[PDB]
Design a protein that fits this description.
Chain D: InterPro entries: CRISPR-assoc_Csx19. This is part of a larger assembly, with chains A (about 550 residues), B (about 170 residues), C (about 600 residues) and D (about 180 residues). Helices cover about 45% and strands about 15% of the residues of chain A. With about 550 residues, chain A is an alpha+beta fold. Classes of the chains: A alpha+beta (about 550), B alpha+beta (about 170), C alpha+beta (about 600), D mainly beta (about 180). The interface of A and C includes residues 170, 251, 410, 418 and 483 of A.
Chain lengths: ~550, ~170, ~600, ~180
C-alpha cells in the first residue's frame, strides 16, 4: 500500500475572526472557521467519496465518532474498502488519508470551493503529500511534509483578500474595510450597510450560539440574554484560555506513540486530539459550577474563551484550570503521552481575564486577554523541565487578570508601566500560577512558582475580607498610597502600622514582618495591591 | 452649540459666618485634616463642593424631585439632559487682613471614664470667620426669566441657610 | 501661511483629555511627548467652534440653521457625520487649522528628565458624592482626579488658509467671528461646569476691534462664498525623460503625531509605521510645480517619491525580509540573536522557527559580521469624542468616541525623490538653489489640520544610485515597498508566476524556482490597501499586492542579468503606481545571500 | 465553462473602446483620471458623446477605464504616454480585430452586489453627506427608499494543482436598484 495524506487548514484565523471589532461577527467567524474543517469537510468528503461522515456528524454533533474504526475504517490492509480515513478534524485544521491522487485533488477542490461560496473571506487551503506505508513511520513524516509544503504553497496561492475589491463608487461597510454589499442591523436595530463577509458572519452567529449553548443547558445563549436574565451584573469578564504543549508534542509525537508503527501513530494522534477537546469541554462543565451568567464564545480543541459574570472569573478560571489539569491527568489518551513528553501525566493551560464593565467593548477586552494570555504563558519558560534539552516547559497553569476600570490604559504595555512606579519597585505580582505546589516541586523554577502562586493572593484577599474589618480599609488605603512611593517610604508607612494591626504580619513578604515587598530578581514586587484589586473578584458559589 | 435664551452671571460675596473646612486629600504635617488648596496653593472653595452644596439644598427644597434638579444641574443618564445649566467656578478664599489659618483641636472623650479616648485626638485646619470668597455662578437659561428654584436658592444664600464643607453639625460651614 | 497663534491662559485648575487614571488617580490628564500637560488641538478646535456656534446662534436670532451658521460651516467646515439624507454638496473643510496648545518651549525644556517635576504640575483633587437623605458619602462614589495647576499659559499655532478670492469684507467677517468666539470662551476640558478649566483664550492680532467691526457690520453680511477644490493644471511642456536618474533624499521628521490610515474600521483608525509617498505628492506639487509639470511627470513616470521609512544607520530603514526566521523560544531580531536566512540556512535541529513579520532592518554589507540594526517606530493611541450639542455630552447619535493610532513626534524618516536628468536640468535652469525649496514644514495624513500631521521635510545632498550586483547564478528580490502587479486581466489578482514572468521579460532572463529542499525559495505575504482620493472625493480602488518585506530568490536558468537594468528597476520600481512608492525592489542584496544563524546583534 | 478574455497591447483608450464598440453597447463605464472618477454611458452603438476629448490622455487624462454591460466588460490601463493594454472579458466567444483571444475555465460564477454611495437625491443622482452627490447612469427614477447596487459575477477556478479553488476574476454586469 501507498496513499496520500491530505491536510486542509484555515489560515489567518486571528485576522478573520477579530478584524471587525464586532461581537456577533467574531462569534460568526469563529463558527465559520470551525464549520469549514468539520461540517464542510464532512460534506465534501461525502460528495467525493460517497461516504456518510456528515450523517454521523449531524447525528452526534461531535467529532468523537471518527475514533471508531467501524465509522472511520483503517485504510491499511486491503481487507477494508475504505479509500478515505480522517485522521483529524478540528477548528481550522483537518487531516485525511486517501489512496488516490485524483480524489485527493477533488477533495481539496470541493472543500475550498464551498468555503468560497458559503464562507466569503475565509482563507482556507489544502495540500496533499505521498504517504509511504512501506515505512513504519511514513505517516508521521507525511504529516510533517504536508505541514511543510502547506506553508510553502500558501505564499504562491492566491490570498483571500483578493476579492470584494473596492470600486470608488461602492459604499463602505459600517464595520469593515470592505465595500458594502448587503444590509444588516446594528445592535440598536438600525439598518446599516455591511459587507458580504460581515453578512455571512452574522448569519452564522445563529448556528454558533446554538452549538455553544448545546454544550450545557445552564449556559446563556447570548450577551443580550445575560442582560435579560442577569440585570444584577456590575462587571463582566472575557476569559481567554489556551492549551499548552500540544504543538511541541505533535511535532515530536513519533517519540511518544511507543510502538514505531503507522497504525499506532494514527490512533494516538487522533485520540489525543479528541481527548483535548473533551478535556476542555468537561473542565468547562465542571468550572461553571462556580456561578448561569456565562456565555461561551469559543469552546473547542485545547482553547476556550467565554464571557463570565465578572468577579466570578478568577474563580471560574482557577476551577477550570484545576479541572483541565485534573481531566488531562485522568484522561488515558493524554496521560501516557504527557508522561513521556514532560515526565508528569498531565497537560496545562493558562488564562487571560480582562474583567470589564458590561458596556465596555468586548473587542478591547479580548485584545487585552490576548496580551494577558501571553503574560500568563510566561510560565512556559520560568518553570521548565529539569535537565531538559531543548528547554521544554514544565506543564504549569497560570492566570493573568486586569480589571480595566478604563483608568489603567487599555493597552497592556501601558497598563503594567503604571504599576512599576520606581525603577526597582513594581506593584503587581499578577502572573499567578494556579498549579499546585506539589505538582510543581519537580520542575526547575519551583521557587518562583511559589512566590507567584495564586493561593498567596487568595489568602491575602481573605485576610482583607476577614472581620468590623480586621485590616481597616482606612489603613489598607494608607498602605496603598505609600506603595507608589519609594520602598523606604512604603516601609516607613508600614512600620507606622505593622503592630497596630496584627493581620499585617500576613501581608508582609520580606520574611521580616516590616515590609510589604519581597525581592524578586532584583525588583521589589508586592502582592498587596493585587490583593486590594482582587478583593471583590474572588467570589464563588462553592 | 447648546441653545441659550439668556445667560446669567450671578455673583456676590460669600462670607464665612462660622469657620470653614473644605478638605483636600488630607494632612499637611500641622493638621490631620488639611484645607483644600488650588494649584497656586491658595485656599479656595472647589466649585464641585459649592455646586453640591447648592444642589443638595435644592434637592431638599424640591422634596428630592429628580426632574427639576436635573433640569438645572444636568444628568449623566437622561437622554435629553446631559450637561448642567449652572456653572460653578472655583473660588479663592480671602482670609481677612492676612490672618493665618486656625488649627482646631479635637478629642473624643470616653463615655465610661470621662477622659480623652485613646487615638481619638485630632486637629482640623479651619478658615477663620469673616473670610470672603466669590459666588461664582453662571446660569444658561433656555426658558424665559429665571427659575423659581434658583431664586429660592439665592434667597437661602442671603439667609445664610446653606452650609459648606466638613463638620457642618460640629460648628463649621 | 503662518503667524497666527491662540494664547490660552488657564485661570483655574484644569483637566483634559483622557479616560484613564494612574496609581492614585482615577482620571489622568493628557500629556504631550514631553510628558507635560497640554490642550490637544481637537479639544481646542472643538471648544472654539462651540463658542463660535454660540455667537452665530445669537446673530441668527436663535435659528439653528441660517446665515451665520453657514459662516461657521465655512470657517470650521461642515460636519457630514451629523447630516443625513441626500446632502448634495461636498463637505467643506475648515479654513482654520488649530494646533495643540503646548507649554512655553523654554519651560518645557526646563522639565526634561525631571520626572518628579512633571508629576508636580498636577495634583489630586478629591471627589465624593453625598447621599441626599443621610448627608453622608455614598458608597462607591469616591474619586481622585488629576488636575493641572492654574496659571498655565499655553499657545497653539493657528493657520487661516483663506481662499484667494475672498473679499476684504468677508475676511473681516471671519476675523470678527473668530475674535468673538474666542472671547466668548471661558471654559475648556473636563468638569468645566464645576470649576475646572477656566481660561482666557486669545488670538494674536484679533483684538476687540474685530468684534466691534462685526457689531457695526453684521447686518450687511451675505452668505459665505461657495467652496471649490484647488484643481490641478497641466502644462504638458515637460521634456522627455533622459538618464541618469538623480536621487534627492528627503528626511521627514514628525513634529506632531501623524495618522497614516492603515485600516479605517468603525470608531478606530490604525496607523502605518511609514509615510507612503502619496502623502508627499502634495508637497512636491507645491515646491516643484512651478519648475515643471508635476502632473505630467507623474503620468509619464518621470517622478518617484518613495515611502518614508524609519531612519536606520543614517539611511532609510528597509522592511524586514520575510526570509528571516527567528528561533521561536530564544531568537529573532528583537532578541538580537538566532536569526536564520532560510534562503541560505537550514532549519536547526529541534528548534522550530517563526518568520519575521515587520519592523525595519538597517544596512548590511556582504561581510557585516553582525545582525543589521533594527529600527522600531513608536506609535500611540489617541482617543477623542464628539459632543451632542444640546445635551453637551457625547451620545450614540453623534458616535461617542473614536481613536487614532499615530506615529508620535520626534520620529525621523527618509524618503527619496527620484527625477530624471532632463527634469533636473529643467529645474536647475530655473533655480540653481532648487533643493533649498525642498525645506518645508507641512501637514500630512488624517486629521492633518488640528492635532495631527505636522512634519518637517528637509532635503539631503543628491544620493548615490543603487549598485545591485549582476550575479549570473541566482537572482534575489527583496520588496521594500508593496508591489502592485496586475494580472493579465488588469485586475490585481496577480500571482508569483506573474512576477516571475514580469522580471523574466524585463531583464530578458529565464528563471526557475530553486529546489534546495531545506531552504525556502518564496516568502511572500499579500497586502490589500484601502485609500481615499481627495481629488476624486471617492475612495481609490482597492490595491492588492504583496507586503513590503516579501522576498524571493530564483535560479537564473538562461540569459545574463544586466546590472544596468537591475539598477534601472531599482530606481523606477516595478508594477502599478511606482510614482507613489510602490514597486521598490532590492536586487541581489547581501542580507538575502548571507547566512545569519551564527551572527548576533552589536536648563 | 469558459471565461473568454481578449488582449490588445499598445492601444489608446479611445481606440480600445472603438474596437469594442459592437460589444460595449449601452455599456456603463468608469474612467479614472488624476482629478476625477467619472461615470459614463456608451450609447446603443457603443460610442461616447465626446469620446476623443473624454478618453484622451494628454492633459490629466484617463489613465484607467472600465466599461461593462450584461454581456462583456472592457478594461484598459495606461502603460506609456496614453497607450495601454486592453482586456475585454466575455462569457461568449466573440470576434474582435487586433485583439488576441484567450480563455480560462471556471468552475462556477457567483453573483455579488456592491451598494453605491448615497440615497436618491438617463441619469439619476444619489447623494450622501459623506461625499456629496454621485450621479449614476440609470434610466428608471428612484424612490426615496431605493438603494442602487452594482452587480458582478466572480468566477471560481482551480489555481493550484492540489485543487485549491479561488475566485480568478470578477466581471461587472450592471447597475441595479434594490
Amino acid at each position: 500500500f501507498q496513499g496520500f495524506l491530505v491536510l486542509i487548514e484555515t489560515s489567518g484565523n486571528q485576522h478573520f475572526i477579530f478584524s471587525t471589532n464586532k461581537l456577533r461577527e467574531n462569534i460568526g467567524a469563529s463558527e465559520l472557521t470551525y464549520l469549514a474543517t468539520t461540517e464542510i469537510l464532512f460534506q465534501g468528503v461525502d460528495r467525493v467519496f460517497q461516504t456518510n461522515y456528515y450523517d454521523q456528524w449531524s447525528d452526534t454533533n461531535s467529532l468523537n465518532f471518527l475514533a471508531d474504526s467501524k465509522l472511520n475504517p483503517a485504510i491499511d490492509d486491503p481487507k477494508n474498502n475504505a479509500d478515505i480515513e480522517i485522521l483529524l478534524a478540528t477548528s481550522g485544521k483537518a487531516i485525511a488519508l486517501v489512496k488516490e491522487e485524483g480524489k485527493a485533488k477533488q477533495l481539496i477542490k470541493e472543500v475550498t470551493k464551498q468555503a468560497l461560496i458559503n464562507a466569503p473571506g475565509l482563507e482556507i487551503g489544502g495540500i496533499y503529500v505521498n504517504c509511504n506505508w512501506q515505512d513504519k513511520l511514513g505517516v508521521a513524516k507525511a504529516v510533517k511534509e504536508a505541514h511543510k509544503q502547506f506553508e510553502v504553497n500558501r505564499a504562491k496561492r492566491a490570498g483571500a483578500n483578493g476579492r470584494f475589491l473596492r470600486l470608488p463608487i461602492a459604499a463602505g461597510c459600517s464595520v469593515s474595510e470592505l465595500p458594502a454589499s448587503d444590509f444588516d442591523y446594528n445592535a440598536d436595530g438600525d439598518k446599516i450597510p455591511v459587507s458580504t463577509v460581515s453578512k455571512v458572519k452574522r448569519e452564522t452567529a445563529k448556528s454558533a450560539k446554538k452549538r455553544l449553548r448545546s454544550v450545557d443547558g445552564r449556559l446563556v445563549n447570548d450577551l443580550a440574554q445575560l442582560e435579560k436574565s442577569f440585570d444584577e451584573l456590575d462587571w463582566l469578564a472575557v476569559v481567554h484560555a489556551d492549551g499548552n504543549g500540544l504543538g511541541q508534542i505533535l511535532l515530536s509525537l513519533e517519540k511518544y506513540i511507543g510502538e514505531q508503527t503507522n497504525r499506532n501513530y494514527i490512533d494516538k494522534y487522533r485520540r489525543l486530539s479528541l481527548a483535548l477537546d473533551n478535556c476542555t469541554i468537561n473542565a468547562f462543565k465542571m468550572a461553571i459550577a462556580v456561578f448561569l451568567p456565562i456565555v461561551p464564545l469559543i469552546l473547542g480543541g485545547d482553547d476556550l474563551t467565554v464571557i463570565c459574570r465578572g468577579d466570578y472569573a478568577l474563580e471560574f478560571t482557577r476551577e477550570f484550570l484545576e479541572a483541565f489539569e485534573g481531566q488531562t491527568e485522568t484522561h488515558d489518551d493524554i496521560k501516557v503521552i504527557a508522561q513521556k513528553a514532560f515526565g508528569v501525566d498531565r497537560l496545562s493551560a493558562c488564562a487571560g481575564i480582562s474583567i470589564i464593565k458590561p458596556h465596555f467593548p468586548f473587542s478591547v477586552a479580548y485584545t487585552l486577554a490576548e496580551r494577558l494570555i501571553k503574560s500568563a504563558k510566561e510560565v512556559k519558560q520560568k518553570v521548565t523541565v529539569t535537565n531538559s534539552s531543548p528547554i521544554t516547559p514544565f506543564p504549569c497553569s497560570a492566570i493573568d487578570f486586569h480589571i480595566l476600570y478604563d483608568s489603567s490604559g487599555i493597552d497592556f504595555d501601558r497598563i503594567r508601566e503604571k504599576l512599576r512606579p520606581e525603577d526597582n519597585t513594581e506593584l503587581y505580582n499578577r502572573p499567578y500560577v494556579v498549579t499546585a505546589a506539589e505538582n510543581l516541586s519537580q520542575a526547575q523554577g519551583y521557587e518562583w512558582s511559589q512566590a507567584h502562586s495564586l493561593q498567596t493572593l487568595a489568602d491575602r484577599v481573605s485576610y482583607l475580607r476577614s472581620e468590623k474589618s480586621a485590616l481597616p480599609s482606612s489603613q489598607s488605603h494608607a498602605l496603598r498610597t505609600a506603595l507608589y512611593l519609594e520602598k523606604n517610604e512604603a516601609d516607613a508607612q508600614y512600620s507606622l502600622i505593622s503592630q497596630r494591626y496584627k493581620i499585617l504580619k500576613n501581608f508582609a513578604e520580606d520574611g521580616e514582618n516590616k515590609s510589604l515587598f519581597h525581592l524578586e530578581n532584583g525588583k521589589y514586587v508586592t502582592r498587596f495591591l493585587d490583593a486590594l484589586d482582587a478583593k471583590d473578584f474572588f467570589a464563588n458559589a462553592n | 452649540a447648546r441653545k441659550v435664551t439668556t445667560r446669567w452671571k450671578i455673583t456676590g460675596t460669600l462670607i464665612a459666618e462660622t469657620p470653614l473646612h473644605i478638605g483636600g486629600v488630607g494632612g499637611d504635617a500641622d493638621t490631620d485634616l488639611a484645607l483644600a488648596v488650588n494649584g497656586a496653593g491658595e485656599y479656595y472653595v472647589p466649585g464641585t463642593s459649592l455646586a453640591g452644596a447648592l444642589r443638595g439644598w435644592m434637592t431638599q427644597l424640591l422634596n428630592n424631585d429628580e426632574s427639576q434638579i436635573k433640569d438645572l444641574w444636568g444628568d449623566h443618564l437622561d437622554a435629553k439632559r446631559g450637561a448642567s445649566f449652572v456653572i460653578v467656578d472655583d473660588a479663592v478664599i480671602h482670609i481677612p487682613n492676612n490672618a493665618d489659618v486656625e488649627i482646631r483641636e479635637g478629642v473624643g472623650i470616653d463615655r465610661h471614664f470621662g477622659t480623652a479616648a485613646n487615638g481619638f485626638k485630632y486637629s482640623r485646619a479651619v478658615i477663620p470667620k469673616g473670610s470672603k470668597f466669590k459666588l461664582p455662578l453662571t446660569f444658561d437659561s433656555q426658558d424665559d426669566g429665571l427659575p423659581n428654584a434658583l431664586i429660592q436658592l439665592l434667597c437661602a444664600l442671603e439667609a445664610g441657610d446653606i452650609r459648606l464643607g466638613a463638620a457642618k453639625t460640629r460648628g463649621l460651614g | 501661511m503662518r503667524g497666527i497663534e491662540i494664547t490660552i491662559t488657564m485661570q483655574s485648575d484644569w483637566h483634559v483629555g483622557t479616560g484613564m487614571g494612574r496609581g492614585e488617580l482615577d482620571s489622568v490628564v493628557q500629556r504631550d511627548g514631553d510628558n507635560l500637560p497640554y490642550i490637544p488641538g481637537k479639544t481646542l478646535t472643538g471648544i472654539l467652534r462651540d463658542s463660535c456656534e454660540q455667537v452665530a446662534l445669537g446673530l441668527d436670532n436663535g435659528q439653528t440653521r441660517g446665515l451665520w451658521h453657514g459662516w461657521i460651516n465655512f470657517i470650521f467646515g461642515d460636519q457630514p457625520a451629523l447630516a443625513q439624507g441626500a446632502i448634495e454638496p461636498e463637505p467643506r473643510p475648515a479654513l482654520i487649522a488649530i494646533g495643540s496648545a503646548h507649554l512655553d518651549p523654554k519651560l518645557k525644556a526646563a522639565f526634561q528628565g525631571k520626572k518628579q517635576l512633571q508629576e508636580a504640575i498636577a495634583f489630586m483633587k478629591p471627589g465624593v458624592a453625598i447621599d441626599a437623605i443621610t448627608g453622608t458619602a455614598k458608597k462607591d462614589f469616591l474619586r481622585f482626579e488629576e488636575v493641572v495647576r492654574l496659571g498655565a499659559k499655553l499657545t497653539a499655532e493657528v493657520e487661516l488658509n483663506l481662499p484667494d478670492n475672498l473679499s476684504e469684507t468677508n475676511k473681516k467677517v471671519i476675523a470678527g467671528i473668530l475674535a468673538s468666539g474666542a472671547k466668548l470662551t471661558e471654559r475648556l476640558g473636563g468638569k468645566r461646569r464645576r470649576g475646572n478649566g477656566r481660561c482666557e483664550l486669545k488670538f494674536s492680532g484679533y483684538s476687540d476691534q474685530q468684534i466691534q467691526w462685526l457689531k457695526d457690520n453684521y447686518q450687511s453680511v451675505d452668505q459665505p462664498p461657495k467652496y471649490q477644490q484647488n484643481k490641478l493644471q497641466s502644462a504638458g511642456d515637460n521634456p522627455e525623460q533622459q538618464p541618469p536618474w538623480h536621487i534627492i533624499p528627503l528626511t521627514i521628521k514628525t513634529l506632531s503625531p501623524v495618522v497614516l490610515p492603515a485600516r479605517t474600521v468603525g470608531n478606530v483608525v490604525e496607523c502605518l509605521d511609514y509615510i507612503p509617498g502619496r502623502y508627499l505628492l502634495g508637497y512636491i506639487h507645491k515646491t516643484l510645480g512651478e519648475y515643471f509639470d508635476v502632473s505630467q511627470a507623474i503620468a509619464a513616470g518621470d517622478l518617484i517619491i518613495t515611502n518614508a521609512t524609519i531612519k536606520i544607520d543614517g539611511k532609510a530603514g528597509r522592511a524586514t525580509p520575510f526570509c528571516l526566521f527567528g528561533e521561536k523560544l530564544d531568537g529573532g531580531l528583537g532578541k538580537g540573536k538566532g536569526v536564520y536566512n532560510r534562503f541560505q540556512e537550514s532549519e536547526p535541529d529541534g528548534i522550530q522557527l517563526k518568520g519575521e513579520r515587520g519592523g525595519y532592518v538597517g544596512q548590511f554589507e556582504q561581510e557585516q559580521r553582525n545582525l543589521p540594526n533594527t529600527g522600531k517606530i513608536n506609535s500611540e493611541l489617541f482617543t477623542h469624542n464628539t459632543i451632542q450639542d444640546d445635551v453637551q455630552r457625547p451620545t450614540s447619535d453623534v458616535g461617542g468616541v473614536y481613536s487614532y493610532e499615530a506615529i508620535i513626534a520626534g520620529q525621523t524618516f527618509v524618503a527619496e525623490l527620484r527625477l530624471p536628468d532632463s527634469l533636473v536640468k529643467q529645474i536647475t535652469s530655473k533655480n540653481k538653489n532648487w533643493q533649498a525649496q525642498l525645506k518645508a514644514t507641512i501637514r500630512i495624513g488624517q486629521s492633518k489640520k488640528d492635532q495631527y500631521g505636522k512634519i518637517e521635510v528637509t532635503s539631503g545632498n543628491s544620493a548615490d544610485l543603487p549598485k545591485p550586483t549582476g550575479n549570473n547564478k541566482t537572482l534575489s528580490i527583496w520588496f521594500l515597498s508593496d508591489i502592485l502587479l496586475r494580472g493579465d486581466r488588469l485586475n490585481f489578482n496577480a500571482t508569483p508566476d506573474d512576477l516571475k514572468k514580469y522580471l523574466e521579460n524585463a531583464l530578458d532572463i529565464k528563471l526557475k524556482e530553486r529546489s534546495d529542499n531545506d531552504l525556502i525559495c518564496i516568502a511572500l505575504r499579500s497586502q490589500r490597501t484601502e485609500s481615499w482620493q481627495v481629488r476624486w472625493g471617492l475612495p481609490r480602488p482597492s490595491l492588492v499586492g504583496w507586503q513590503a518585506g516579501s522576498c524571493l530568490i530564483y535560479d537564473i536558468e538562461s540569459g545574463t542579468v544586466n546590472a544596468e537594468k537591475l539598477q534601472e528597476l531599482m530606481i523606477t520600481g516595478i508594477g502599478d503606481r511606482c510614482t507613489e512608492g510602490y514597486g521598490q525592489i532590492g536586487f541581489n542584496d547581501p542580507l538575502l545571500s548571507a547566512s545569519l544563524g551564527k551572527l548576533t546583534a552589536k536648563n | 465553462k469558459n471565461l473568454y478574455h481578449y488582449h490588445q497591447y499598445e492601444i489608446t483608450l479611445e481606440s480600445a473602446v472603438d474596437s469594442c464598440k459592437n460589444h460595449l453597447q449601452a455599456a456603463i463605464g468608469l474612467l479614472y483620471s488624476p482629478q476625477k472618477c467619472e461615470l459614463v454611458k456608451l450609447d446603443n452603438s457603443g460610442k461616447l458623446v465626446d469620446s476623443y476629448n473624454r478618453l484622451k490622455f494628454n492633459n490629466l487624462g484617463v489613465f484607467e477605464a472600465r466599461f461593462f454591460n450584461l454581456n462583456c466588460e472592457l478594461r484598459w490601463v495606461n502603460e506609456s504616454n496614453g497607450n495601454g493594454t486592453a482586456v475585454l472579458l466575455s462569457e461568449s466567444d466573440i470576434t474582435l480585430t487586433g485583439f488576441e483571444k484567450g480563455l480560462q475555465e471556471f468552475i462556477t460564477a457567483i453573483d455579488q452586489q456592491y451598494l453605491l454611495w448615497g440615497e436618491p437625491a438617463g441619469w439619476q443622482r444619489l447623494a450622501e453627506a459623506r461625499i456629496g452627490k454621485l450621479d449614476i447612469p440609470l434610466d428608471n427614477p428612484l424612490k426615496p427608499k431605493d438603494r442602487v447596487f452594482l452587480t458582478s459575477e466572480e468566477y471560481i477556478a482551480e489555481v493550484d494543482d492540489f485543487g485549491n479553488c479561488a475566485v480568478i476574476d470578477e466581471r461587472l454586469i450592471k447597475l441595479e436598484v434594490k
